[PDB]
Structure 1
Amino acid sequence: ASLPHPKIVKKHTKKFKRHHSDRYHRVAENWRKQKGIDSVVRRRFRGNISQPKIGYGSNKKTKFLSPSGHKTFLVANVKDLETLTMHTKTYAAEIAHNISAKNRVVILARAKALGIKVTNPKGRLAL
């Protein structure tokens, strides 16, 4: 029950991992560009890891879209939730990570009354 959209195509689903991050613990997986003049990764030899570039950019008609077809909007309270009262078919609300369970109950009740989709309705509310 979202806005009709074309099929969502991801050009590169795999994560871009930094070179030698699998080799050394001190090298994190956060992507860094290799600046070495003799780097085979920088020179793009066959068999090495892929590198991020603008060709992998996603379609503008499906960018920032969840698999259900909505754009995620963070909400912390009822006033934040009610900003999406008219944009129901395009935006889905996600409760912020630091919202307590007592306020999450109120947010879920208000979203159910307004017909607004909630991405994470089970959080902190186990029965």
Structure 2
Amino acid sequence: LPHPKIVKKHTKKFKRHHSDRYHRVAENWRKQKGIDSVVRRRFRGNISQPKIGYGSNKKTKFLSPSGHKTFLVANVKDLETLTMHTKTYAAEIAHNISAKNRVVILARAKALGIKVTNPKGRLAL
């Protein structure tokens, strides 16, 4: 489906301050609550923070590079929901679905023309 070119604004990950220094501090983002932090007062040369200016374009939000919204699917009955919306959404076979059932979902999605984002998942020969 016709979509605009995707502009991300911030490709990088917003890592927590001193997450790379200490091992006990996770890389998962937290705001520096302290009043004397040079990160909170956004000094020159300090890490960039998540703020609403970095918001992605609404017409190209949640879209994979192919211009498709990813949609998790467990089985045939849930895949059959995207019959009408083939160029908007693309199927994502859930991680816990067995190798026996993935071949069922892939064949059925080929028949209805619904795109699967992850083939080759549990498809060893």
What TM-score do you get using the length of structure 1 for normalisation?
A: 0.97
Tell me, which stretches of 5 or more residues in structure 2 are unaligned? none
1:92-118 per-residue CA deviation (whole Å, 9 max, x = no partner) reads 000000000000010001001111100
- Report the secondary structure of 1:42's partner residue: coil
Alignment-derived partner of residue 18 in structure 1: 16
1:1-36 per-residue CA deviation (whole Å, 9 max, x = no partner) reads xx1001000100000000000000000000000011
Post-superposition shift, 1:126? Answer: 1.3
Instruction: Give the RMSD, CA atoms, in angstroms.
Output: 0.4
Task: Give % identity.
Answer: 100
Alignment-derived partner of residue 89 in structure 1: 87
- Report the secondary structure of 1:55's partner residue: helix
Tell me, which stretches of 5 or more residues in structure 1 are unaligned? none
**Matches of 1:106 and 1:80, distance apart in 2:** 13
Aligned residues: 125
What TM-score do you get using the length of structure 2 for normalisation?
A: 0.99
Post-superposition shift, 1:121? Answer: 0.8
Post-superposition shift, 1:90? Answer: 0.5
Alignment-derived partner of residue 118 in structure 1: 116
1:47-76 per-residue CA deviation (whole Å, 9 max, x = no partner) reads 000000000000000000000110000000
- Report the secondary structure of 1:8's partner residue: coil
